[PDB]
Each structure stands twice: as C-alpha cells, then as structure tokens.
C-alpha cells in the first residue's frame, strides 16, 4: 500500500492559502526519494529532518498541506518567517519537522485577464498561531464604528484575489505548495519508508 501523494501533488485544483487543504496520510509506505530527486519541484527544503534520510524514518502521522501563493511568498513558508502569508494565512512553528515543496503553476493557475479564484487574507488583527486555518469572511473593522456586514469606509473585505495574469513577473506568478509535516507521538508509527 503506497502513500497517496499522487492525489496531493497532482490534484487538478489547489486550495486558496487562507483555506489551506490538509490531507492526513497513514498506514502506507512512502518513497520520499522519488519526490526529493524530482525535476518537477523548484523548492524542496526540509527542517528538523534530512531529506536524503526520509526513507529510513517512521512516524505516527504525516500531514500534506497544500495551497497556491505568489513565487516571492514561497520563502514565507518556513519557520521564523513574517509577512502577509506567514502572519495571516499559513504559519509554520519554530520547531517545524517536515518538508516544504513548491513549483511554478503559471500554466494552470493563471488566465488571460486575471485568475481571481485564488485568494489570500490581507486583513487580520493579529498573527495566526502555527497550523491555524482562519476561514472567516467577516467584514474587517478598521475604525471604531461597527461594520454591520457592510463593505465600505473603514470596513474592508478581509480576503483579496491574487489576480494571476500569465504576463506577471515570475515572482508574482502562482506557485503550488505542498507542506509535509511529520509527527511522532506515543502511538505506533504507521507511516514508514521502503525498507
């Protein structure tokens, strides 16, 4: 029984970063070397674990988080980062144990005149905690007067569309991201490498 990474990495549609998708992986064998050595990924960075040592370790659960962001935001998907993405959309903990994989998806996620399907949270009063997913669409109150669900002066729609156009500069193009998190609790290890 191989791990279903194909349905995570090769999904036709990816989530918006504010509503990031989480896939729980368990009771399967995973060959992480076919991923680490693949030419299709422009970013493959591991934290708390050696990438060339993944096939020899065992974990209780593996999480595969996936979403789309700009290319120049992929650097925020790492421990200790700040920015609109790290602070208000997807936050990794300082002690993160896992891998961050990314690749350019301008061919799938951009369209003539703009692709406004992909969104990110622009307004939030405070930073997210690690692995927090805020899907609120409540009107953001930027002044003392309540908004009453009405977008207007000092009452902003908290989410913004990226508006990916194929003509965008590479750092502003959409990138598909997959974050593999490895947890080891006081329970038997169900996810292992090919041994």
């Amino acid at each position, epitope marked *: 029984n191989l791990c279903p990474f194909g349905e995570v990495f090769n999904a036709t549609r990816f989530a918006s970063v504010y509503a990031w998708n989480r896939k729980r992986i368990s009771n399967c064998v995973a060959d992480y070397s076919v991923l680490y050595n693949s030419a299709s990924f422009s970013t493959f960075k591991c934290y708390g674990v050696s990438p060339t040592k993944l096939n020899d370790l065992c974990f209780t659960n593996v999480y595969a988080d996936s979403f789309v962001i700009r290319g120049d935001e992929v650097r925020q998907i790492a421990p200790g980062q700040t920015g609109k993405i790290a602070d208000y959309n997807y936050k990794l903990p300082d002690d993160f144990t896992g891998c961050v994989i990314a690749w350019n998806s301008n061919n799938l996620d951009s369209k003539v005149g703009g692709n406004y399907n992909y969104l990110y949270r622009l307004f*939030r009063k*405070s*930073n997210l905690k690690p692995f927090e997913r805020d899907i609120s669409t409540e009107i953001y*109150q930027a*002044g003392s007067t309540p908004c009453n669900g009405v977008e207007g002066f000092n009452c902003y729609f908290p989410l913004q569309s990226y*508006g990916f156009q194929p*003509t*965008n*500069g590479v750092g*502003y193009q959409p990138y598909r991201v997959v974050v593999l998190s490895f947890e080891l609790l006081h329970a038997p290890a169900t996810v292992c490498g090919p041994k």
Partner: antibody
Amino acid sequence: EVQLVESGGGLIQPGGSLRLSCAASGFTVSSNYMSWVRQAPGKGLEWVSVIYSGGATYYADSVKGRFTISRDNSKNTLYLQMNSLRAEDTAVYYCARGDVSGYRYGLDYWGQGTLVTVSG
Amino acid sequence: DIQLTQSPSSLSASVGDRVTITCRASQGISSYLAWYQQKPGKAPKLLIYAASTLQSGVPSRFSGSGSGTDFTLTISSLQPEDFATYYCQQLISYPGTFGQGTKLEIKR
C-alpha cells in the same frame, strides 16, 4: 473625518537622531497597515517603512538599520525613530494609511508632512 | 526589482483638452497600480487605485486604465484646478516604487 497630523520634524545635525509622530483620528492605527513616505525638496516620492496590524515591519533599503517604525495603540499614534541622519535624509516625511506590497488600495489618507532638515 | 517609467515628464495643455499620462512597468504587475495627484505644498492625493478604480470624491474626468505593464491616467477635459504633479505607483511589492512624476501645466 480622517485626520493625520505629523510632528517632530525640524533641523538636526548630521549623525543626529529625531523621532517623528503621526497622531491619527478617524480610523484605528493598530488595525491598519501604516506607512511613512518621504519627498526630498524638488524630488519625487519614496516609501520608507510600513507597520502591519499584527506587528510585522518592513523598510526601504536606504533606511534599513537606521530607522524604526512603531505605534502607540492608546494614543492612536504612529512613530518613526530616525538614527544616524545624513544630508540625503532631508525631506518632507508623510505618514499614510496603507501598504505598498500586495495592497491594491494604495495610500488613501496622508498627513500634511513634516520637514526634516539634516544640516550643521 | 520593478522599474516604473512614467511619461511625459511634463505636459502643457489647454482647458478642455484630453490629457493622457502613461506608466510602464518593467515586469507584469497585473492591476497593482495607483495614481496620485500632488499640488504645491500639499501631500499627494490618491485618485485611482487597483489601476482603474476611482477613489471616493474624485471627479469623473479622471480615469485609469491598463493591466500588466502599460497603464494610463486620462483627464478627459482638463480644468484649471488640475495643475499638479501626477505620480503612478506600483503596489505589487516593496518598496512600492513611484514613477518619476508628470508636471501638468495649463495653457492659457
């Protein structure tokens, strides 16, 4: 009615320090992206710094390591601490509501500006 | 980094004339652009954001167009009070570069 009022500008010798203040009314400083922008006499506009509601701060390469942006929630005021000032820092400094990166709204409200003259 | 080339540097036009100011970005920035109007001794005033959305209170003679690399600010019928320096600004990344500016004077 939105009001932004800068103060603290004036003459300062090269190598000196100054702290600018921007008292705001009509919106909550701690809930918004707040920026500082400067304009040297007879020149164009230059974004200097931003503070996010969550606390993140960003700076132009020309002021990095010398300037610090901050705010006081209870006073609804924005600050710019400027150290090791040079002649090329001479400008009208404006506080503005908004951000300049992934922020389509631009800078909608600006104060009147405070002139900083770096001279001996 | 993105370069913003605003043109022309200066413009002279009669009252009632149609005036166009252009801004070209070195890379595609979608609609992340604003236009500002600055009068003597005053702070810049936001006219248009998201490349074509008029800011509240701005007269209908001002309009913005473009997406990607080429952007235009048009005044369809120039009024004496429109004498000002106009600036474009990219809003896609730090440092939110402003264009060089266009000084618009009125022929009379």
